[PDB]
Amino acid sequence: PPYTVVYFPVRGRCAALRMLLADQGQSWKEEVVTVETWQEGSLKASCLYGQLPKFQDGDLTLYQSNTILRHLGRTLGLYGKDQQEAALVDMVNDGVEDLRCKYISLIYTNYEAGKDDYVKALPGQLKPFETLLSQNQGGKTFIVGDQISFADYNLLDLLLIHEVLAPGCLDAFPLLSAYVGRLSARPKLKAFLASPEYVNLPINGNGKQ
Amino acid sequence: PPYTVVYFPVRGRCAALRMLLADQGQSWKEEVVTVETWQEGSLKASCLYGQLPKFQDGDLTLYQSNTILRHLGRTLGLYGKDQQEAALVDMVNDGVEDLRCKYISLIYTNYEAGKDDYVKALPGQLKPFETLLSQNQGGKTFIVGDQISFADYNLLDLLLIHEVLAPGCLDAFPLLSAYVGRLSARPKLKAFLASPEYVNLPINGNGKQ
Ligand SMILES: N[C@@H](CCC(=O)N[C@@H](CSC(=S)NCCc1ccccc1)C(=O)NCC(=O)O)C(=O)O
Ligand SMILES: N[C@@H](CCC(=O)N[C@@H](CSC(=S)NCCc1ccccc1)C(=O)NCC(=O)O)C(=O)O
Ligand SMILES: N[C@@H](CCC(=O)N[C@@H](CS)C(=O)NCC(=O)O)C(=O)O
Ligand SMILES: [Ca+2]
Ligand SMILES: [Ca+2]
Ligand SMILES: [Ca+2]
Ligand SMILES: [Ca+2]
Numbered sequence: 001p002p003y004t005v006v007y008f009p010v011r012g013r014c015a016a017l018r019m020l021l022a023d024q025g026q027s028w029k030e031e032v033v034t035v036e037t038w039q040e041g042s043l044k045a046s047c048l049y050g051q052l053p054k055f056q057d058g059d060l061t062l063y064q065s066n067t068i069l070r071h072l073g074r075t076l077g078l079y080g081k082d083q084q085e086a087a088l089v090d091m092v093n094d095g096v097e098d099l100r101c102k103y104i105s106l107i108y109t110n111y112e113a114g115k116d117d118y119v120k121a122l123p124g125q126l127k128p129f130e131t132l133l134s135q136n137q138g139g140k141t142f143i144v145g146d147q148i149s150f151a152d153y154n155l156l157d158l159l160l161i162h163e164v165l166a167p168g169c170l171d172a173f174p175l176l177s178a179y180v181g182r183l184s185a186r187p188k189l190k191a192f193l194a195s196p197e198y199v200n201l202p203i204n205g206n207g208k209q
Numbered sequence: 210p211p212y213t214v215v216y217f218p219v220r221g222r223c224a225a226l227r228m229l230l231a232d233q234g235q236s237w238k239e240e241v242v243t244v245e246t247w248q249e250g251s252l253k254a255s256c257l258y259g260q261l262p263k264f265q266d267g268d269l270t271l272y273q274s275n276t277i278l279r280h281l282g283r284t285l286g287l288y289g290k291d292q293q294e295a296a297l298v299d300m301v302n303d304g305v306e307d308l309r310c311k312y313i314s315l316i317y318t319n320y321e322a323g324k325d326d327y328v329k330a331l332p333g334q335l336k337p338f339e340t341l342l343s344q345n346q347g348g349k350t351f352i353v354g355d356q357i358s359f360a361d362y363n364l365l366d367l368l369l370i371h372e373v374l375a376p377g378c379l380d381a382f383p384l385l386s387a388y389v390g391r392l393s394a395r396p397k398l399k400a401f402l403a404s405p406e407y408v409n410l411p412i413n414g415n416g417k418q
């Protein structure tokens with residue numbers, strides 16, 4: 001396969017770029033890193049920022065999940081039609097990353113005490129994406145413009161894991177709800193989402209979701 | 210001016226994009242939002258993600274500091290020479306963002322008790338950028354390729370504020386040390402760094418640095 005994903009045995013920060021690769025009909029190898037292998041120390045010391053994922057595209061080696069998304073966006077043409085749309089795509093993805101950071105903080109450092117405060121705050125955090133949809137062809141296509149972008153895959157992942165965290169959290173947002181149904185139904189993506197290599201991984205690395 | 214920056218009266222997440230604009234000979238307007246105006250709520254409610262900075266380039270309104278950097282990178286030609294370099298620029302900026310998030314967490318939530326632990330870990334956090342320099346023309350040009358990129362401006366800001374937090378922290382890193390001196394001496398940037406509109410703002414908004 002032309003691509004390699006090196007990551008822990010979780011969906012985590014690779015879920016979106018995997019969806020992107022599958023949906024775009026690309027093949028890739030998964031190199032799995034166990035917690036035991038990681039704690040040995042050598043792989044970690046060879047990573048630019050001491051962390052995974054690590055990504056190989058031919059002889060190009062990348063770290064940083066959003067760097068990989070943007071690289072795939074750039075090279076597969078999933079980055080809007082012009083500089084104006086590209087800025088909007090970035091704006092969406094940066095918003096997705098901000099909420100992803102908050103989600104990761106809850107999961108790994110404060111799940112038990114923090115969950116209901118997080119869920120009470122969640123509608124306010126999702127609304128900006130509903131508003132973006134409302135402003136683009138009535139929410140009937142994609143988050144930016146009329147072609148899919150890397151930001152769509154990242155947003156879709158974020159929505160999917162929040163429905164697991166808080167089932168029904170999207171019920172107050174008709175555009176986001178139809179959007180999730182619509183993108184998920186894209187044939188290659190639907191098949192990937194139902195496959196063992198997706199379904200049989202946990203969302204996070206600590207048993208929580 | 211063709212650009213407007215709407216922000217709190219701090220350097221914060223606007224320092225890099227201001228350095229970029231100044232160094233690239235651009236003019237721009239500063240629209241300042243006081244804590245009192247922000248508390249009133251109406252401006253905040255109008256912001257896409259409820260936060261600043263807000264950036265205007267003509268009738269294009271952007272939110273998210275790194276979206277603004279990437280936008281200016283794209284439109285002003287500070288994004289590498291090809292697709293591979295663009296990926297590397299992204300990789301650097303995402304690394305800078307990660308450390309900035311840690312820096313901000315320290316400053317605003319845990320400065321008193323957490324500073325010693327932060328400073329101890331700091332060499333491990335700066336080494337990646339030294340390594341990147343060592344692999345690009347002996348560290349004698351820019352963080353990626355032969356021309357300046359938006360990532361350089363963000364890295365430069367990150368380095369400057371860490372020298373204030375922990376004076377001498379760059380002493381162990383020859384290439385980053387020389388890099389800071391070299392970019393700081395670029396004529397338009399040198400002038401900006403010495404101007405009241407930079408010098409008379411605090412780095413952060415809580416009195417700590
Ligand atoms: N900005 C980076 C973040 C990479 C990252 O957080 N990687 C994690 C895995 S990805 C993820 S969703 N993990 C949850 C957050 C976490 C961070 C650090 C330790 C444990 C959990 C990792 O490698 N941890 C091991 C280590 O730091 O030694 C990116 O987007 O790729
Ligand atoms: N990902 C965004 C982050 C924007 C951001 O954090 N804006 C802060 C200002 S920028 C900064 S460096 N502030 C320090 C961190 C902070 C965050 C939230 C509240 C207070 C301080 C803000 O608007 N706070 C007001 C509010 O949320 O009501 C970006 O990069 O632009
Ligand atoms: N063309 C330059 C830089 C431009 C660039 O990086 N473009 C990316 C920025 S992440 C993009 O959004 N391209 C979308 C488009 O061409 O519409 C290169 O290949 O280095
Ligand atoms: Ca495979
Ligand atoms: Ca396309
Ligand atoms: Ca609680
Ligand atoms: Ca429903």
Ligand SMILES: [Ca+2]
Nearest residue numbers: 236237238239
């Ligand atoms: Ca001005």
Ligand SMILES: [Ca+2]
Nearest residue numbers: 285286287356
């Ligand atoms: Ca250039």
Ligand SMILES: [Ca+2]
Nearest residue numbers: 322323325326
């Ligand atoms: Ca301490």
Ligand SMILES: [Ca+2]
Nearest residue numbers: 379380381386
């Ligand atoms: Ca020195």
